[PDB]
Design a binder for this molecule. Structure first.
Ligand code: XNE
Ligand code: ZN
Ligand code: ZN
Length: 232
C-alpha cells in the first residue's frame, strides 16, 4: 500500500514495482539461496516509448513475472537490459529476457565471470568501462565502473534526469549490519570504490541498494562504514 516492499511481503515468484521518480521504478523480487530467502532490487528507466531494464529479478520465473508486472503497471516494451555484475540476482533471467525480445548487455568482465561460474550470459559487451572511474552513456542512464567492491565487475547506474543513483550490490541499505554476501568481494578496495561514487555523483537524491530499502546519499557512507568494520 505504498511503502517500499520488504522480504516477508513478497512471496518467491512475485514481483513488485515501486515508483522512484518520473520515469524511474525499482523492481523487487525474492529468492531462496542456500536455504534462506532474500529480497533484491533492480531498476526500470523510461526510454521514450520503450523501457531500459537494469538487472534481472533473480531467476527465470521471477524474471518472467517481472515482465508481466511491467506490462500490467507500465505497458511499454522492455527493449534493452543491463546486468550490473555476474551473480544470479543480476543475470539469472537473462535467457528469459533474450527470448522475450530484450537485448541483454553487460561488461566484458561480467560476461567472462558469468560464463566461468555457469550463470546466464548477457549477449552484448559494454566496452569503455574497464578502468575505475570510467563512465559511458546507455540510453537514459550513465553506467559507471567505480572499481572492485562487492565484486570486481560491479557497475553503478545514474539516471541524470532524476538524480537517481542505483548502486547495485556495491551499496547497502541503512539497516545493514553486515557486508552481505562477500564471497567475491574486495573488502580492502570497496571503501575506495565507494569514495569514487561519492565524488562522481554528489547531486544524487535517491540511492538504491542492490538489496533493501532506498534512501539518500548516506547509504554510501554507511556502506563504507559497514565494509570497514567487517574487514576489521
Ligand atoms: C545471488 C548472490 O550470490 C552471491 O553473492 C554468490 C557469491 C558466491 C557464490 C559461490 N560461487 C555464489 C553466489 C547472493 C545470494 C544470497 C545472498 C546474497 C546477498 C546478501 C544481501 C544481504 C544480506 C544481509 N541480510 C542477511 C539476512 O538477514 C539480514 C540481512 N545478506 C546477503 C548478496 C549481496 O550482498 O549482494 N548477494 C547474495
Ligand atoms: Zn552479487
Ligand atoms: Zn547482490
Amino acid at each position: 500500500s505504498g511503502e517500499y516492499p520488504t522480504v516477508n511481503e513478497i512471496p518467491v515468484g512475485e514481483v513488485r514495482l515501486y515508483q522512484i521518480a518520473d520515469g524511474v521504478w525499482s523492481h523487487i523480487a525474492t529468492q531462496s539461496f542456500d536455504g534462506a530467502v532474500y529480497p533484491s532490487n533492480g531498476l526500470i528507466v523510461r526510454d521514450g516509448d520503450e523501457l531500459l531494464l537494469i538487472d534481472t529479478a533473480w531467476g527465470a520465473k521471477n524474471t518472467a513475472a517481472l515482465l508481466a508486472e511491467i506490462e500490467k503497471q507500465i505497458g511499454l516494451p522492455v527493449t534493452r537490459a543491463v546486468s550490473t555484475h555476474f551473480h544470479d540476482d543480476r543475470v539469472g533471467g537473462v535467457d528469459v529476457l533474450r527470448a522475450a525480445g530484450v537485448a541483454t548487455y553487460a561488461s566484458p568482465s561480467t560476461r567472462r565471470l558469468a560464463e566461468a561460474e555457469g550463470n546466464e550470459i548477457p549477449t552484448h559487451s559494454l566496452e569503455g568501462l574497464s578502468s575505475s572511474g570510467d563512465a559511458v552513456r546507455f540510453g537514459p542512464v550513465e553506467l559507471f565502473y567505480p572499481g572492485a567492491a562487492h565484486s570486481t565487475d560491479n557497475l553503478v547506474v545514474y539516471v541524470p534526469s532524476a538524480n537517481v543513483l542505483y548502486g547495485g550490490c556495491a551499496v547497502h541499505e541503512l539497516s545493514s549490519t553486515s557486508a552481505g554476501n562477500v564471497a567475491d568481494a574486495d573488502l580492502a578496495e570497496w571503501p575506495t570504490s565507494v569514495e569514487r561514487i561519492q565524488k562522481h555523483y554528489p547531486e544524487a537524491e535517491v540511492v538504491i541498494p542492490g538489496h533493501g530499502l532506498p534512501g539518500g546519499l548516506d547509504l554510501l557512507q554507511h556502506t563504507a562504514n559497514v565494509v570497514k568494520a567487517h574487514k576489521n
